[PDB]
Amino acid sequence: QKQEETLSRLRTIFDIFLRENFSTTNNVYFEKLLTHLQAKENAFVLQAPFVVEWVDRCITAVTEDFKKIHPKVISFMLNLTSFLANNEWMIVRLRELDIVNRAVKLLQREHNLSPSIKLGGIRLMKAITVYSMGLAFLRMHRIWTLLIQYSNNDHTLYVVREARQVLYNMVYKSCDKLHDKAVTLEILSEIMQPIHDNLDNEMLHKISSTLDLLSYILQQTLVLEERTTLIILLKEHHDFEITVWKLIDMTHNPYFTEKIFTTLSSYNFALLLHEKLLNEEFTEFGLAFFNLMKFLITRKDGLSFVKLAELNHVLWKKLGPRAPKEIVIQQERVTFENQLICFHMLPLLFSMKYFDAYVVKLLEISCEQTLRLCYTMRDNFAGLANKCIHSLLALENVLDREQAVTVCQALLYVLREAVADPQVLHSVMVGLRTLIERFKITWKESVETIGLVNCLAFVLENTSMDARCTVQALKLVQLAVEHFLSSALVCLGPIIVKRMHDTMWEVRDTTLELTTSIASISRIKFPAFQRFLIDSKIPPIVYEMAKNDSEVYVRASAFQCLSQMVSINLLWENGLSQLDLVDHLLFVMYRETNDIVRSEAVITLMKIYEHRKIHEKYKNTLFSTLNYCVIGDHHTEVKLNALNFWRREFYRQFSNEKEIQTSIAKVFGEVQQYGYFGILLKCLREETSMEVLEFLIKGVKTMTEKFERYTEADEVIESILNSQDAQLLEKAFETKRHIDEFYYKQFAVPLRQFFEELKTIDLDQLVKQHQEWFECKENFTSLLDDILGALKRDDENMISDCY
Amino acid sequence: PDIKITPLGAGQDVGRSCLLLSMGGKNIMLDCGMHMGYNDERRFPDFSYIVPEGPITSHIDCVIISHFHLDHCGALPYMSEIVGYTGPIYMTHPTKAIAPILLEDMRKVAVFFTTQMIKDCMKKVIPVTLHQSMMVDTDLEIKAYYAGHVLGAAMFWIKVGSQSVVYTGDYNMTPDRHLGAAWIDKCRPDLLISESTYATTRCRERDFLKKVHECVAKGGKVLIPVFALGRAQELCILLETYWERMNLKYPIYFALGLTEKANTYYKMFITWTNMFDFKHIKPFDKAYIDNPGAMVVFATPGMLHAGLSLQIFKKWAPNENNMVIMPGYCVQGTVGNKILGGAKKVEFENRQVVEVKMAVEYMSFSAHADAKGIMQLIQNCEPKNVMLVHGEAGKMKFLRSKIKDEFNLETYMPANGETCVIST
Ligand SMILES: [Zn+2]
Ligand SMILES: [Zn+2]
């Protein structure tokens, strides 16, 4: 069986690794192996008695000295040990041998490990620390000071986000398993030490790092669903708030104070969850939170305020179901969720306003403790608006139903005031668009949608800003049309026509998107009041700019618009049928490369043929071009659309004793004379793609139950080589349509041959081949063969280059 | 003030080029590129480094893309549509109109990110012209300088309040045929990121023409897999001029869905460096492959990924006289790497092995900067620190000693995911 073969290949390559001389770039291979050792299917290659022997040999080869014994194999070794450390049998074999102890000592006694050995060792620590015996060893070895060293000093930032998880896991598991508080107190004191010791610019780094680590520990306890005693230990022995409030006293920085305020707020929320869970009102959190926010008011800092409000919101949403949503602060019924968003929105409203006109309507949502803080904010009084908007729209992942409505209304107000720097404008328009399309803020929820459309019309019309904002404006108008449905017409009349003539690509494509949206609205969903808006001048300009605008995406968008607005009767009867449209489609479907637009031309043709009539003189050319549109080197979309055309045509024509037998035989005769069975054979036996195969298989299968019943040359070389390509092109600069109407005659295969030639050929093998080969393309054995070839061959002149 | 750079890719490596110039209190993202090796989520740069679990990014002030190679552009739709991003994306006009074609071709080869994502990702793009100081919101001033190495490549000069950075990306300081040499004024930045692909490093051009001519005469066909743009237009002047100065009669087919791009490239070329049809070039179809006489077929893609080039290669393989002049690096996993690596057998759709007997060749055409070019660039710019990100580890280690020896500067070589704090 192949298992011994792949194990032998792995044995050979592992034997290659240990050799003292090594020079191999192209790191990919290593990571590939690691991923292919993670999959559970290869679970036998770790069970074999070879890998642990390799690990032992490499470690006893690295522990005495590795000045140069392994450049990068060590990282693979540690990751492989971590992959081994899962408990079936490896844990006791690793325990009985001196592997894990030597690895930890190796990590301890080194000085300048490159940041891939470190992550491997930390991965080993994480994989071993989930088990009880691993925790016993870690408690024995006094390992945590190394983890503090990593999470405090190193520059990797992929290590610290991995080291802190192991650190917090030891702290939580030691606390919650009823183990001695001596070790937990020692860990916490070791974390706490750079602050207690201090109670320039060098100690501040240690202070900030340990504050951030403490905040991470507290937030991870906040995620927890069970009662833990870590917070009481943190409050009692190393009294936290008093030390932190003494720490804020001397040192001064705006960036550094965000960390102290987030650790204080995270501590408050963690204390709530781990004191209220077991020993009413929430006043104890209340006074602390509000004097904290008052201190942020008094310090006169803007960005830290909105960031802290954001994080308070995130944490409260992180509490989850165990939150009453109504806090009894002091004899009151104060719902907490609204005051966070009031604090969040207020800097934006106060910044863009400049004496209150609209915030006064908002503040009745807030309660008196928020009113006093707002009234001292106003007395307390840069680019702060866009930061607040981006914070608000960072919150949108977790924001349930009504705060979305409130923030949408506030953004509507700030947009209305901004209309009557463009960065705030672009930010608010993007945010309003994404909130509307996510939270379904249809006209019943918003109040002043007329102001929205009017200010958007002014923006689109009278000032002509840069094109990065006009696109967003047209997207907003599109959302307003298709969601705020229940003035607009005279505003959207000339601006569409003017923007369809814009100098830039980015505006014309978006305007075509808006036009096809409002044309799709003009169907049965909405009355014809939109149609006469379109019926002024739009279908001529759409057609004659779909003809030639010299940008491929523009022509694609125009063709799909013209497909959408051709199946409505008023436009076709008034101003579209006069233009010979099918002629231009036939010209496009054949004599036009860049086949992103050919597929949508096929769609437009499908709509025209299905919902209208074409002249009887075009049918031969039509079917010839349609047969050509699938046979030949075309992209997948064109072939799939053309097969959709043929299936729709076949089924549509099919709905029109002996008499039924003769009529049905005539129907198959009419469809085969133009050629449909033979083209299916030639597309089935030859065309190689993924989804076309399933489409053809399901089509033929659905069909086949309703079917079976019925010297001299060197002077030119040196002359070429001694002139630039700018001088071989000055010389180069200075010096049919509508295919013949009987192209389909060759693809005219009768029904009788379609019996036999479909009976002989296999069906599921065609769809099976191209998927099974892709599954076997990157199997483990192929990777081992490739990496053996890479190791044995050493071509120095083959350089990894800019792809 | 402390400049921090933390390459999420392309540090002691190539591909996934992505650098985070967090400096002056304003986050900036350099090139956003893909890695055509890995097929898992490692293909695009890891973005959990900035905002974990957050599908919207509100930290980077601006994203700067140097040139259109798919190790500097391929992740841009993923960075702008899957992970949200709505801020500006500054890039040059030829790169702006060349990138969608390459991204669409990569989409077709890889089948995930739809054409709608391609369009929406580049409605955000802002184009920048050379030597024109354009400002993001306030005290984030960007200038672009002519670089080389591909059509429409520039290297950028970023200033945030008396702290300048010059990011080169890709450049070429030697004079050449296609594009000349990059130029820089006497700005004195507090950093200069650079390239070190050719730290250790005519004859690469004569051996192309003189070999393809001597191979086409013997009745053997020639296959040249290329991408849509880039290197496919480096050669289609040499072959056409070689077969117009010397009268030849063999056809050189050109892979039909490619020919209109050869007009756009040379339309932009004469604008950048300082209708169009070819004489002996005619596009071809799947029927011409089995025809008996000699040909020189260009095809897409350029690493024998999948598509036209693989089906052509699957039929011309057993013949001895045929040849496959791959013109660029072939990454791990493409049939190109096995063939350039001495494989004489390659597997296929149903346990079929094509016994390659064709004469595979390899000729690099990229024209990066060699060893002398980087010290020439340093002598023109005179920075305060030097940083090398693009290339292999040992070559940068060797170049660091020479830089320290000559100019007495420092030199940093970060790994993937390692902040490099630089002081003043
Ligand atoms: Zn490049
Ligand atoms: Zn590159």
Side-chain angles (χ1 to χ4, degrees), chain B residues 17 31-34 65-77 91 95 99 103:
Chain B
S17 189
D31 313 302
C32 176
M34 90 187 287
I65 309 292
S66 57
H67 66 312
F68 62 86
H69 273 149
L70 281 184
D71 56 334
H72 307 241
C73 275
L76 190 65
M91 65 181 288
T95 318
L103 286 173

mmCIF file with all atom_site columns, all heavy atoms in Angstrom, chain B residues 17 31-34 65-77 91 95 99 103:
data_model
loop_
_atom_site.group_PDB
_atom_site.id
_atom_site.type_symbol
_atom_site.label_atom_id
_atom_site.label_alt_id
_atom_site.label_comp_id
_atom_site.label_asym_id
_atom_site.label_entity_id
_atom_site.label_seq_id
_atom_site.pdbx_PDB_ins_code
_atom_site.Cartn_x
_atom_site.Cartn_y
_atom_site.Cartn_z
_atom_site.occupancy
_atom_site.B_iso_or_equiv
_atom_site.pdbx_formal_charge
_atom_site.auth_seq_id
_atom_site.auth_comp_id
_atom_site.auth_asym_id
_atom_site.auth_atom_id
_atom_site.pdbx_PDB_model_num
ATOM 1   N N   . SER B 1 17  ? 3.740   41.352 -1.722  1.00 0.00 ? 17  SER B N   1
ATOM 2   C CA  . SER B 1 17  ? 4.427   42.576 -1.327  1.00 0.00 ? 17  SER B CA  1
ATOM 3   C C   . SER B 1 17  ? 3.456   43.512 -0.623  1.00 0.00 ? 17  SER B C   1
ATOM 4   O O   . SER B 1 17  ? 2.468   43.945 -1.216  1.00 0.00 ? 17  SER B O   1
ATOM 5   C CB  . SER B 1 17  ? 5.055   43.256 -2.533  1.00 0.00 ? 17  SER B CB  1
ATOM 6   O OG  . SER B 1 17  ? 5.886   44.325 -2.129  1.00 0.00 ? 17  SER B OG  1
ATOM 7   N N   . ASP B 1 31  ? 2.377   48.728 -1.331  1.00 0.00 ? 31  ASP B N   1
ATOM 8   C CA  . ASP B 1 31  ? 1.786   47.823 -2.323  1.00 0.00 ? 31  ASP B CA  1
ATOM 9   C C   . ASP B 1 31  ? 0.940   46.727 -1.695  1.00 0.00 ? 31  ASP B C   1
ATOM 10  O O   . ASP B 1 31  ? 1.205   46.282 -0.582  1.00 0.00 ? 31  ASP B O   1
ATOM 11  C CB  . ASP B 1 31  ? 2.872   47.148 -3.156  1.00 0.00 ? 31  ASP B CB  1
ATOM 12  C CG  . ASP B 1 31  ? 3.903   48.102 -3.667  1.00 0.00 ? 31  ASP B CG  1
ATOM 13  O OD1 . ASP B 1 31  ? 3.549   49.054 -4.386  1.00 0.00 ? 31  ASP B OD1 1
ATOM 14  O OD2 . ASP B 1 31  ? 5.086   47.863 -3.382  1.00 0.00 ? 31  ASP B OD2 1
ATOM 15  N N   . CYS B 1 32  ? -0.094  46.311 -2.408  1.00 0.00 ? 32  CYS B N   1
ATOM 16  C CA  . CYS B 1 32  ? -0.970  45.228 -1.971  1.00 0.00 ? 32  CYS B CA  1
ATOM 17  C C   . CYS B 1 32  ? -0.928  44.137 -3.032  1.00 0.00 ? 32  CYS B C   1
ATOM 18  O O   . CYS B 1 32  ? -1.531  44.281 -4.095  1.00 0.00 ? 32  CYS B O   1
ATOM 19  C CB  . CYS B 1 32  ? -2.386  45.740 -1.758  1.00 0.00 ? 32  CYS B CB  1
ATOM 20  S SG  . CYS B 1 32  ? -3.572  44.465 -1.340  1.00 0.00 ? 32  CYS B SG  1
ATOM 21  N N   . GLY B 1 33  ? -0.230  43.034 -2.754  1.00 0.00 ? 33  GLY B N   1
ATOM 22  C CA  . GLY B 1 33  ? 0.024   42.028 -3.760  1.00 0.00 ? 33  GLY B CA  1
ATOM 23  C C   . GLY B 1 33  ? -0.390  40.643 -3.302  1.00 0.00 ? 33  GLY B C   1
ATOM 24  O O   . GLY B 1 33  ? -0.607  40.397 -2.119  1.00 0.00 ? 33  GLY B O   1
ATOM 25  N N   . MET B 1 34  ? -0.493  39.741 -4.269  1.00 0.00 ? 34  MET B N   1
ATOM 26  C CA  . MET B 1 34  ? -0.866  38.358 -4.024  1.00 0.00 ? 34  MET B CA  1
ATOM 27  C C   . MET B 1 34  ? 0.338   37.456 -4.220  1.00 0.00 ? 34  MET B C   1
ATOM 28  O O   . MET B 1 34  ? 1.372   37.868 -4.747  1.00 0.00 ? 34  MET B O   1
ATOM 29  C CB  . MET B 1 34  ? -2.011  37.925 -4.947  1.00 0.00 ? 34  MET B CB  1
ATOM 30  C CG  . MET B 1 34  ? -1.574  37.341 -6.273  1.00 0.00 ? 34  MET B CG  1
ATOM 31  S SD  . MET B 1 34  ? -2.947  37.028 -7.391  1.00 0.00 ? 34  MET B SD  1
ATOM 32  C CE  . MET B 1 34  ? -3.694  35.600 -6.624  1.00 0.00 ? 34  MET B CE  1
ATOM 33  N N   . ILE B 1 65  ? 0.058   51.864 -4.682  1.00 0.00 ? 65  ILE B N   1
ATOM 34  C CA  . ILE B 1 65  ? 0.439   50.730 -5.512  1.00 0.00 ? 65  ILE B CA  1
ATOM 35  C C   . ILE B 1 65  ? 1.479   51.195 -6.518  1.00 0.00 ? 65  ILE B C   1
ATOM 36  O O   . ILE B 1 65  ? 1.266   52.185 -7.225  1.00 0.00 ? 65  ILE B O   1
ATOM 37  C CB  . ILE B 1 65  ? -0.773  50.124 -6.228  1.00 0.00 ? 65  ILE B CB  1
ATOM 38  C CG1 . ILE B 1 65  ? -1.890  49.852 -5.232  1.00 0.00 ? 65  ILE B CG1 1
ATOM 39  C CG2 . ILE B 1 65  ? -0.374  48.856 -6.894  1.00 0.00 ? 65  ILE B CG2 1
ATOM 40  C CD1 . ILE B 1 65  ? -1.572  48.772 -4.255  1.00 0.00 ? 65  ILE B CD1 1
ATOM 41  N N   . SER B 1 66  ? 2.600   50.481 -6.593  1.00 0.00 ? 66  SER B N   1
ATOM 42  C CA  . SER B 1 66  ? 3.674   50.926 -7.471  1.00 0.00 ? 66  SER B CA  1
ATOM 43  C C   . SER B 1 66  ? 3.432   50.504 -8.915  1.00 0.00 ? 66  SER B C   1
ATOM 44  O O   . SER B 1 66  ? 3.218   51.353 -9.783  1.00 0.00 ? 66  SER B O   1
ATOM 45  C CB  . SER B 1 66  ? 5.016   50.398 -6.966  1.00 0.00 ? 66  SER B CB  1
ATOM 46  O OG  . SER B 1 66  ? 4.993   48.989 -6.867  1.00 0.00 ? 66  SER B OG  1
ATOM 47  N N   . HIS B 1 67  ? 3.428   49.200 -9.196  1.00 0.00 ? 67  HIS B N   1
ATOM 48  C CA  . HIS B 1 67  ? 3.297   48.738 -10.572 1.00 0.00 ? 67  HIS B CA  1
ATOM 49  C C   . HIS B 1 67  ? 2.395   47.516 -10.635 1.00 0.00 ? 67  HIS B C   1
ATOM 50  O O   . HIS B 1 67  ? 1.955   46.991 -9.613  1.00 0.00 ? 67  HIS B O   1
ATOM 51  C CB  . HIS B 1 67  ? 4.659   48.448 -11.212 1.00 0.00 ? 67  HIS B CB  1
ATOM 52  C CG  . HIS B 1 67  ? 5.409   47.313 -10.597 1.00 0.00 ? 67  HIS B CG  1
ATOM 53  N ND1 . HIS B 1 67  ? 5.586   47.179 -9.240  1.00 0.00 ? 67  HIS B ND1 1
ATOM 54  C CD2 . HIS B 1 67  ? 6.068   46.275 -11.166 1.00 0.00 ? 67  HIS B CD2 1
ATOM 55  C CE1 . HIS B 1 67  ? 6.301   46.095 -8.996  1.00 0.00 ? 67  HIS B CE1 1
ATOM 56  N NE2 . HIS B 1 67  ? 6.611   45.530 -10.149 1.00 0.00 ? 67  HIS B NE2 1
ATOM 57  N N   . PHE B 1 68  ? 2.123   47.062 -11.853 1.00 0.00 ? 68  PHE B N   1
ATOM 58  C CA  . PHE B 1 68  ? 0.992   46.183 -12.109 1.00 0.00 ? 68  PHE B CA  1
ATOM 59  C C   . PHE B 1 68  ? 1.310   44.707 -12.000 1.00 0.00 ? 68  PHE B C   1
ATOM 60  O O   . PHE B 1 68  ? 0.459   43.889 -12.357 1.00 0.00 ? 68  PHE B O   1
ATOM 61  C CB  . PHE B 1 68  ? 0.395   46.463 -13.489 1.00 0.00 ? 68  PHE B CB  1
ATOM 62  C CG  . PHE B 1 68  ? 1.331   46.218 -14.637 1.00 0.00 ? 68  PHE B CG  1
ATOM 63  C CD1 . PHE B 1 68  ? 1.463   44.965 -15.192 1.00 0.00 ? 68  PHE B CD1 1
ATOM 64  C CD2 . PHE B 1 68  ? 2.034   47.256 -15.198 1.00 0.00 ? 68  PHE B CD2 1
ATOM 65  C CE1 . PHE B 1 68  ? 2.300   44.748 -16.243 1.00 0.00 ? 68  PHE B CE1 1
ATOM 66  C CE2 . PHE B 1 68  ? 2.863   47.042 -16.258 1.00 0.00 ? 68  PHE B CE2 1
ATOM 67  C CZ  . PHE B 1 68  ? 3.002   45.788 -16.776 1.00 0.00 ? 68  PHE B CZ  1
ATOM 68  N N   . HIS B 1 69  ? 2.508   44.336 -11.560 1.00 0.00 ? 69  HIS B N   1
ATOM 69  C CA  . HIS B 1 69  ? 2.822   42.923 -11.432 1.00 0.00 ? 69  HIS B CA  1
ATOM 70  C C   . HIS B 1 69  ? 1.931   42.280 -10.382 1.00 0.00 ? 69  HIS B C   1
ATOM 71  O O   . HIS B 1 69  ? 1.585   42.904 -9.380  1.00 0.00 ? 69  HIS B O   1
ATOM 72  C CB  . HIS B 1 69  ? 4.277   42.731 -11.050 1.00 0.00 ? 69  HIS B CB  1
ATOM 73  C CG  . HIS B 1 69  ? 5.202   42.676 -12.214 1.00 0.00 ? 69  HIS B CG  1
ATOM 74  N ND1 . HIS B 1 69  ? 6.498   43.129 -12.149 1.00 0.00 ? 69  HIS B ND1 1
ATOM 75  C CD2 . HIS B 1 69  ? 5.022   42.223 -13.476 1.00 0.00 ? 69  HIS B CD2 1
ATOM 76  C CE1 . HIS B 1 69  ? 7.082   42.952 -13.318 1.00 0.00 ? 69  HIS B CE1 1
ATOM 77  N NE2 . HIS B 1 69  ? 6.206   42.411 -14.144 1.00 0.00 ? 69  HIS B NE2 1
ATOM 78  N N   . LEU B 1 70  ? 1.565   41.025 -10.608 1.00 0.00 ? 70  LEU B N   1
ATOM 79  C CA  . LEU B 1 70  ? 0.599   40.407 -9.714  1.00 0.00 ? 70  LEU B CA  1
ATOM 80  C C   . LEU B 1 70  ? 1.157   40.078 -8.340  1.00 0.00 ? 70  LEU B C   1
ATOM 81  O O   . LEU B 1 70  ? 0.419   39.519 -7.527  1.00 0.00 ? 70  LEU B O   1
ATOM 82  C CB  . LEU B 1 70  ? 0.016   39.149 -10.343 1.00 0.00 ? 70  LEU B CB  1
ATOM 83  C CG  . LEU B 1 70  ? -1.070  39.436 -11.369 1.00 0.00 ? 70  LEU B CG  1
ATOM 84  C CD1 . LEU B 1 70  ? -1.670  38.147 -11.875 1.00 0.00 ? 70  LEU B CD1 1
ATOM 85  C CD2 . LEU B 1 70  ? -2.127  40.308 -10.746 1.00 0.00 ? 70  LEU B CD2 1
ATOM 86  N N   . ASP B 1 71  ? 2.411   40.393 -8.036  1.00 0.00 ? 71  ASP B N   1
ATOM 87  C CA  . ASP B 1 71  ? 2.842   40.411 -6.652  1.00 0.00 ? 71  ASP B CA  1
ATOM 88  C C   . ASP B 1 71  ? 2.790   41.813 -6.067  1.00 0.00 ? 71  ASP B C   1
ATOM 89  O O   . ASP B 1 71  ? 3.374   42.053 -5.011  1.00 0.00 ? 71  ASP B O   1
ATOM 90  C CB  . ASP B 1 71  ? 4.247   39.828 -6.495  1.00 0.00 ? 71  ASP B CB  1
ATOM 91  C CG  . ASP B 1 71  ? 5.261   40.527 -7.343  1.00 0.00 ? 71  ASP B CG  1
ATOM 92  O OD1 . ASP B 1 71  ? 4.855   41.079 -8.371  1.00 0.00 ? 71  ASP B OD1 1
ATOM 93  O OD2 . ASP B 1 71  ? 6.461   40.515 -7.005  1.00 0.00 ? 71  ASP B OD2 1
ATOM 94  N N   . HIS B 1 72  ? 2.139   42.754 -6.745  1.00 0.00 ? 72  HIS B N   1
ATOM 95  C CA  . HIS B 1 72  ? 1.870   44.060 -6.162  1.00 0.00 ? 72  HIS B CA  1
ATOM 96  C C   . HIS B 1 72  ? 0.457   44.556 -6.432  1.00 0.00 ? 72  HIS B C   1
ATOM 97  O O   . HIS B 1 72  ? 0.147   45.690 -6.064  1.00 0.00 ? 72  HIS B O   1
ATOM 98  C CB  . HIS B 1 72  ? 2.859   45.121 -6.673  1.00 0.00 ? 72  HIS B CB  1
ATOM 99  C CG  . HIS B 1 72  ? 4.301   44.754 -6.522  1.00 0.00 ? 72  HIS B CG  1
ATOM 100 N ND1 . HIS B 1 72  ? 5.176   45.487 -5.754  1.00 0.00 ? 72  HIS B ND1 1
ATOM 101 C CD2 . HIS B 1 72  ? 5.035   43.768 -7.086  1.00 0.00 ? 72  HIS B CD2 1
ATOM 102 C CE1 . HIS B 1 72  ? 6.380   44.949 -5.828  1.00 0.00 ? 72  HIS B CE1 1
ATOM 103 N NE2 . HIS B 1 72  ? 6.321   43.899 -6.628  1.00 0.00 ? 72  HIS B NE2 1
ATOM 104 N N   . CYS B 1 73  ? -0.398  43.771 -7.086  1.00 0.00 ? 73  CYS B N   1
ATOM 105 C CA  . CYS B 1 73  ? -1.760  44.206 -7.380  1.00 0.00 ? 73  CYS B CA  1
ATOM 106 C C   . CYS B 1 73  ? -2.828  43.155 -7.148  1.00 0.00 ? 73  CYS B C   1
ATOM 107 O O   . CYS B 1 73  ? -4.003  43.517 -7.098  1.00 0.00 ? 73  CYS B O   1
ATOM 108 C CB  . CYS B 1 73  ? -1.870  44.667 -8.832  1.00 0.00 ? 73  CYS B CB  1
ATOM 109 S SG  . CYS B 1 73  ? -1.414  46.358 -9.131  1.00 0.00 ? 73  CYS B SG  1
ATOM 110 N N   . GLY B 1 74  ? -2.486  41.878 -7.004  1.00 0.00 ? 74  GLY B N   1
ATOM 111 C CA  . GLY B 1 74  ? -3.488  40.833 -7.099  1.00 0.00 ? 74  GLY B CA  1
ATOM 112 C C   . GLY B 1 74  ? -4.430  40.749 -5.922  1.00 0.00 ? 74  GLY B C   1
ATOM 113 O O   . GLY B 1 74  ? -5.516  40.179 -6.052  1.00 0.00 ? 74  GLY B O   1
ATOM 114 N N   . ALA B 1 75  ? -4.042  41.289 -4.780  1.00 0.00 ? 75  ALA B N   1
ATOM 115 C CA  . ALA B 1 75  ? -4.892  41.258 -3.602  1.00 0.00 ? 75  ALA B CA  1
ATOM 116 C C   . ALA B 1 75  ? -5.743  42.504 -3.465  1.00 0.00 ? 75  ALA B C   1
ATOM 117 O O   . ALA B 1 75  ? -6.501  42.614 -2.500  1.00 0.00 ? 75  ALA B O   1
ATOM 118 C CB  . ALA B 1 75  ? -4.042  41.084 -2.347  1.00 0.00 ? 75  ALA B CB  1
ATOM 119 N N   . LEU B 1 76  ? -5.625  43.437 -4.401  1.00 0.00 ? 76  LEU B N   1
ATOM 120 C CA  . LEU B 1 76  ? -6.338  44.707 -4.294  1.00 0.00 ? 76  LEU B CA  1
ATOM 121 C C   . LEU B 1 76  ? -7.856  44.536 -4.310  1.00 0.00 ? 76  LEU B C   1
ATOM 122 O O   . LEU B 1 76  ? -8.529  45.173 -3.482  1.00 0.00 ? 76  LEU B O   1
ATOM 123 C CB  . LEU B 1 76  ? -5.824  45.646 -5.390  1.00 0.00 ? 76  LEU B CB  1
ATOM 124 C CG  . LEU B 1 76  ? -6.202  47.112 -5.395  1.00 0.00 ? 76  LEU B CG  1
ATOM 125 C CD1 . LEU B 1 76  ? -5.611  47.750 -4.180  1.00 0.00 ? 76  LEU B CD1 1
ATOM 126 C CD2 . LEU B 1 76  ? -5.671  47.770 -6.642  1.00 0.00 ? 76  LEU B CD2 1
ATOM 127 N N   . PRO B 1 77  ? -8.463  43.717 -5.186  1.00 0.00 ? 77  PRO B N   1
ATOM 128 C CA  . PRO B 1 77  ? -9.897  43.436 -5.007  1.00 0.00 ? 77  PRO B CA  1
ATOM 129 C C   . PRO B 1 77  ? -10.243 42.770 -3.689  1.00 0.00 ? 77  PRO B C   1
ATOM 130 O O   . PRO B 1 77  ? -11.299 43.067 -3.121  1.00 0.00 ? 77  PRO B O   1
ATOM 131 C CB  . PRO B 1 77  ? -10.212 42.520 -6.189  1.00 0.00 ? 77  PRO B CB  1
ATOM 132 C CG  . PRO B 1 77  ? -9.282  42.938 -7.204  1.00 0.00 ? 77  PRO B CG  1
ATOM 133 C CD  . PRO B 1 77  ? -8.009  43.198 -6.485  1.00 0.00 ? 77  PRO B CD  1
ATOM 134 N N   . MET B 1 91  ? -2.417  55.472 -7.624  1.00 0.00 ? 91  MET B N   1
ATOM 135 C CA  . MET B 1 91  ? -1.618  54.691 -8.562  1.00 0.00 ? 91  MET B CA  1
ATOM 136 C C   . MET B 1 91  ? -1.581  55.431 -9.892  1.00 0.00 ? 91  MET B C   1
ATOM 137 O O   . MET B 1 91  ? -2.295  56.412 -10.092 1.00 0.00 ? 91  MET B O   1
ATOM 138 C CB  . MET B 1 91  ? -2.167  53.265 -8.650  1.00 0.00 ? 91  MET B CB  1
ATOM 139 C CG  . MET B 1 91  ? -3.531  53.158 -9.216  1.00 0.00 ? 91  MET B CG  1
ATOM 140 S SD  . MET B 1 91  ? -4.140  51.467 -9.272  1.00 0.00 ? 91  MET B SD  1
ATOM 141 C CE  . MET B 1 91  ? -3.163  50.770 -10.565 1.00 0.00 ? 91  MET B CE  1
ATOM 142 N N   . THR B 1 95  ? -0.650  52.009 -15.073 1.00 0.00 ? 95  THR B N   1
ATOM 143 C CA  . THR B 1 95  ? -0.962  50.919 -14.163 1.00 0.00 ? 95  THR B CA  1
ATOM 144 C C   . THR B 1 95  ? -2.457  50.855 -13.909 1.00 0.00 ? 95  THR B C   1
ATOM 145 O O   . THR B 1 95  ? -3.024  49.766 -13.783 1.00 0.00 ? 95  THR B O   1
ATOM 146 C CB  . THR B 1 95  ? -0.203  51.087 -12.852 1.00 0.00 ? 95  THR B CB  1
ATOM 147 O OG1 . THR B 1 95  ? 1.133   51.505 -13.132 1.00 0.00 ? 95  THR B OG1 1
ATOM 148 C CG2 . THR B 1 95  ? -0.133  49.777 -12.129 1.00 0.00 ? 95  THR B CG2 1
ATOM 149 N N   . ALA B 1 99  ? -3.958  47.249 -14.914 1.00 0.00 ? 99  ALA B N   1
ATOM 150 C CA  . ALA B 1 99  ? -4.325  46.327 -13.841 1.00 0.00 ? 99  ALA B CA  1
ATOM 151 C C   . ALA B 1 99  ? -5.651  45.584 -14.016 1.00 0.00 ? 99  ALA B C   1
ATOM 152 O O   . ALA B 1 99  ? -5.691  44.396 -13.651 1.00 0.00 ? 99  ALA B O   1
ATOM 153 C CB  . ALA B 1 99  ? -4.318  47.082 -12.509 1.00 0.00 ? 99  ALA B CB  1
ATOM 154 N N   . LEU B 1 103 ? -5.970  41.469 -13.675 1.00 0.00 ? 103 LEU B N   1
ATOM 155 C CA  . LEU B 1 103 ? -6.794  40.916 -12.608 1.00 0.00 ? 103 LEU B CA  1
ATOM 156 C C   . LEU B 1 103 ? -7.904  40.037 -13.167 1.00 0.00 ? 103 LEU B C   1
ATOM 157 O O   . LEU B 1 103 ? -8.207  38.981 -12.603 1.00 0.00 ? 103 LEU B O   1
ATOM 158 C CB  . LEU B 1 103 ? -7.366  42.040 -11.754 1.00 0.00 ? 103 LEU B CB  1
ATOM 159 C CG  . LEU B 1 103 ? -6.345  42.687 -10.826 1.00 0.00 ? 103 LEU B CG  1
ATOM 160 C CD1 . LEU B 1 103 ? -6.925  43.902 -10.146 1.00 0.00 ? 103 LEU B CD1 1
ATOM 161 C CD2 . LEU B 1 103 ? -5.911  41.677 -9.810  1.00 0.00 ? 103 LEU B CD2 1
#
